[PDB]
């Protein structure tokens, strides 16, 4: 039923800062939707980065952080390094199911 929308692609440059967002067809996204950011690296590799809106996965470089910016879930990258080129997914828990966003290609160094 619900649809989760993310930016299709963001282009950034090294040493700069970038923010990715996650939107719901329901209403605002809050701490209750359980916003999780998943990182996909080239050739089908995944690793959770954030979970619980602002809880970083262990090991993940400090330059990454989640939060909520208004009615949307968000991922912030500070001093984006080339090692951040990847597809960022977000997911939301709506009542009886998880819905994944379309995914955001993050072209580090554009």
């Amino acid at each position: 039923q619900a649809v989760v929308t993310q930016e299709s692609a963001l282009t950034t440059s090294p040493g700069e800062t970038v923010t990715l967002t996650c939107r719901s067809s329901t209403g605002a996204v809050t701490t209750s939707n359980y916003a999780n950011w998943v990182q996909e690296k080239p050739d089908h590799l995944f690793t959770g980065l954030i979970g619980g809106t602002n809880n970083r996965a262990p090991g993940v470089p400090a330059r990454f952080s989640g939060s909520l910016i208004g009615n949307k879930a968000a991922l912030t990258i500070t001093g984006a390094q080339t090692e951040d080129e990847a597809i960022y997914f977000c997911a939301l828990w709506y009542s009886n199911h998880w819905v994944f966003g379309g995914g955001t290609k993050l072209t580090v160094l554009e």
Binding site: F46, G48, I50, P58, N96, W98
Partner: protein, 118 residues
């Protein structure tokens, strides 16, 4: 060093069921949830469903109901997912991933995925 092991592929002719497995190691199995996810370009991530090791109890994406069958093997620390009649949509990656029902609410560890090419 947490790890979720999934066989690489499956190559089958249409309308042919397949059982998929996912092995866990380096942590305490029954203490976390198991979710199966599907990938295939276009965005691609669709949640198939979850399974609670303890319970044997599941929550499935209503889309995949008359399709997928979730089960586990407690002793081998292995999660399963059967697919009935591979009509042929199914040519996709099937992932197993770790989820903290009792926790920090993240999909931290992921399996390499089992590709299914019909």
């Amino acid at each position: 060093q947490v790890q979720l092991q999934q066989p690489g592929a499956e190559l089958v002719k249409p309308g042919a069921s397949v059982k998929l497995s996912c092995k866990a190691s380096g942590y305490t199995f029954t203490s976390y949830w198991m979710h199966w996810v599907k990938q295939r370009p276009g965005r691609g991530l669709e949640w198939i469903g979850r399974i609670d090791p303890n319970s044997g109890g599941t929550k499935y994406n209503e889309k995949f109901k008359s399709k997928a069958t979730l089960t586990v093997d407690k002793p081998s620390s292995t999660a399963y997912m059967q697919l009935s009649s591979l009509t042929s949509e199914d040519s996709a990656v099937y992932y197993c991933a770790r989820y903290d029902y009792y926790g920090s609410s993240y999909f931290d560890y992921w399996g390499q995925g089992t590709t299914v090419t019909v």
